[PDB]
Amino acid sequence: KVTPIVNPSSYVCNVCNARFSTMSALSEHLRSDHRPMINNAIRSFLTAWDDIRILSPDVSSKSLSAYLDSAVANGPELIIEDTGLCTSFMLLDNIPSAHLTKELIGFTWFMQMYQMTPPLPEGAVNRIVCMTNWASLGDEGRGLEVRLPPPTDSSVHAYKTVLSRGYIDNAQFNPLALRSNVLLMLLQFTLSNLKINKSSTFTSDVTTITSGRMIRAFEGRPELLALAYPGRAVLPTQTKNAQFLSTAIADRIGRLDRANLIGGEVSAMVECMELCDALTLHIRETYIMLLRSMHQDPTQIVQIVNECANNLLNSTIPISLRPTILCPWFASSEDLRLQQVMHLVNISSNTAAALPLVEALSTLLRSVTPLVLDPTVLTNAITTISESTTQTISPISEILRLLQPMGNDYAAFWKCIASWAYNGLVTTVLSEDAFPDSSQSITHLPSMWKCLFLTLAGPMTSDPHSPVKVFMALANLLAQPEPIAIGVPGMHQTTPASQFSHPGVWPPGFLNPQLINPQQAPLLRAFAEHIRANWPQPSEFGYGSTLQGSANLFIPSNRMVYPWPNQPLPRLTVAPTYDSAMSNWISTTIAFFIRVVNSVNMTATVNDLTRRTMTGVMTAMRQVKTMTPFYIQHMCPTELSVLASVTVTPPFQVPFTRLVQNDVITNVLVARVDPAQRGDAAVDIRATHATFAAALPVDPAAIVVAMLCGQTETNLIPSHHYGKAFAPLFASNAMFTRNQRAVITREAFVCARSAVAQCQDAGFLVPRPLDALRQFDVTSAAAAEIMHAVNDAFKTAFDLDGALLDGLALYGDPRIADLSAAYLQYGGNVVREHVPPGPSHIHRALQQVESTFMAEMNLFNVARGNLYLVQTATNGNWSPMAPVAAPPFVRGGPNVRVVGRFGTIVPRPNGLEPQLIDDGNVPRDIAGDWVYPSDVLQVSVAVFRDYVWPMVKAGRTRVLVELGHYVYTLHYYDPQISLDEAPILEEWLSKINPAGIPPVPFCIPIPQVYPCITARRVHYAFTSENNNDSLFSTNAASIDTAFGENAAVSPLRWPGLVDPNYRVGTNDLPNRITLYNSLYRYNFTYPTLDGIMYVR
Amino acid sequence: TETNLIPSHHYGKAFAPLFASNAMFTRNQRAVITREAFVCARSAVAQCQ
Amino acid sequence: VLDPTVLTNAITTISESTTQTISPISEILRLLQPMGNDYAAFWKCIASW
């Protein structure tokens, strides 16, 4: 059938044959027929339901925080431009004058009569309503917006954004969570409005209206050209707009100073005057000021890329001029720290998080390395030692059994290297199944060669208890010949060398080898002499660039500690040398186990000819010319300096420790909550912070193959081989993605911990401009909805996909959001290097919006001041929003009475009037002046409507409704027709719950153009404070308003258009908002790294 | 606790069925009967001995 | 209301619960076992005061 063109005028219920004029009437009556205990959950499911809103503070996604390599790899949208004009307030016409009942020729004049669109609205009520981006034709709008309906509508769905869905129904707003809902709208006002002002095109005004002024050329959209420029209005008749637009100064339009640089090239920054509020323009200019803060000039970003690549990459920049080159990619060193902790807060602090993170290096580490493992060399070094085959036990064959993995299993060496950048999260542990057991002796031959493989692979693994496990695995293995004293009791010498993972059970002989007697244990003192002398020195090196900064927390910035005494990278042909600390470590173990093999204990048991075989194997193993001693000292610290800034996470390091008892890093700790707000400032740091329990069981048999048998191509130039391998992973700007992440991680963190502490009472040191507003629910789960919604907005406005700000509610109390980090040493070093947020920009922007919200609350459909309910039966002008008289009966005045907490009428017998309990718990009579608090009237509303509200209609009492700030809904009527406000105002009383109130129905007459006869009418509701701050013009198309107020267009809104004393560049911004300002548009080109530099 | 909790409205909505019950009033009526049944029974075993 | 999911999200991240890890963890997995009569041992312990 044919599709319908118009909605049905009558809606059917089909249950009962009931006609409905409105679908909203059918929406309630179908809901009415659904309604014991069963129908209440059915009615509430249709009551508090809506999913059409963007923000979901009530949907608490449990453990959504999960770090991903692709989550940071998507950068946030920062460069969103605004080709249109940057105002947030459209001049909305509520009541056109065509809706006026009496119409005579010539009283009202329309521009539509002359085939022309008006610059200013033309009706009988013109409000200034907050509708963001109504004129913004910029590319790819910010997602979230706020679009308030005019005051004739309900205008409460913009104020149910948090703490309001399940608690109050649709027709109400929650006044005890009002400061939350208003401020979260202002965040939605700000982040919807973080655009870049872009100059479109500028033609000369060829026509006679301004005669040559460089007009904004809205080419394809003339319906916005007339609205951009009120100065180019045609003023045919004496419209009341034409009364105002006659005062428009002629040269306040178009561009003034095009700051161009290069002839032919697009200009840098024009300076034009057009229609814009003073508030959006402040949000735009602080966004460029944000966007310059991560900009660096191209002479300095080539120093960053070369220092990030350690100056072995061929990146050249042209030396010339480049006009418009915003390349915004540079978070400071402070902001990278704030993301790095936020990286560690999102993750699970077990081994489920570092184990993705190590192989992120180790995949790229094996991709670029020149070190080619080839285990044939150490095989050919051992199988070419001579052994008589007549023996029962072969020391050649019984150690290649303990040497070969079946697969490759050689990337575990490269995971062992890649864990050095991540020793804060994970500590690689010697694999417990590779320790020799506490059953076999030193005469048992494969048990000894395990202890060689542990001692060689000792300094590779980053566990702080590695050398005590190396020392004990031999001290276990010769407990019968050489006994010593082992620490506290319960840990004996035959404890199987894996349970010595605590610093308290290091033996005293290992700390001081003088405590081991050479006359008792000569072979075991010399192994304590071995480890304390030859264990490598924990050196350090730099990475990244000092200009960019780094996400180091405990290491000083742009540095990395390293468990080996490194040397800089050579650029000539390299050869395996024995000057390394590796070769110092390797040769002295073999020099120690040639002593153990040729000791007295092995002499009595092991045959002398097969003892020469073991000596011959290790001396062959010592003389294997392998490149890994040169590699770990020279070539490997270069690529751990390079890959530390191209992997998705910067290295989180904790300083290494060579055998110091008091400097063993027992725990590495990061908290989500500072110990000052909760009373935990003096307790142990393990109770205040969360700890990273991660470990990797590195197999030592695969390390010794990798360590003692590793070679490289003969003609290797290590600058060339690193310069060729690192080139595909610096050509893109994707390296700078985490800098764009870290600022948005900052700007969301500062603004969320503000928005929580704004809604608390005196939380962190944040300024509180909205503290006049009502906020009662300050609990954890209330503030959990606030931070989750701010998180829901920064993930929407910058439309990213990572996990920022999640996991700050892991413990469940985001009222205390402070990021700290620490590590405890066994001596009791309690470092606590905690990181505050940086000097953010959007937190300065929201703070300015909140300050200028308070001066113009009425502009956002929120009235301030109390509420008056007196019977005012008048005939003339009636202005509830602007009470021209003095506000009667202020609180505490002459015999004005304040109701106590219950709102309790006591009944009196035998014709006596019912008394009302006041604040002093005294029943006082109804007739008189009363003040009701808002919360008393929320629970006494049936007692109000039945006992003291009919006393208001009789005019014998007057009730003040004391409440701070409130959403108002205006109602209009033809004043020629009679009206009584009580059917309009009892509908307000009929929906006041104990949970929330509806917006307040003020009745206002439409201002008439004729001096017409007016009906006597009775009004009840009006306000005390002047709340008429959103009325733009009382009546526009008419020549003159007659009956209503003569509220013409205020020139205070427009200094930039009508004031001769207006200087370019001024605003009264904490006060009222100027709607026509001078500004700056931009023409930034957005180069890639190919547009900056050239990389071969 | 509840994500929208006011301790004044919740305790009023919770204690409201509790005061409609006459357990405050049955407690006093069973106590005055027990005492009258105590004294009549304390002396009924004391007069027989 | 008594909902352990704030604890349970905070405690399942830092736990491991693998076959080489059950022997320390298994006492507090019994804590996380959600089979309970809406935590009657708590409110019975208040009511005994």
Ligand SMILES: [Zn+2]
């Ligand atoms: Zn029906």
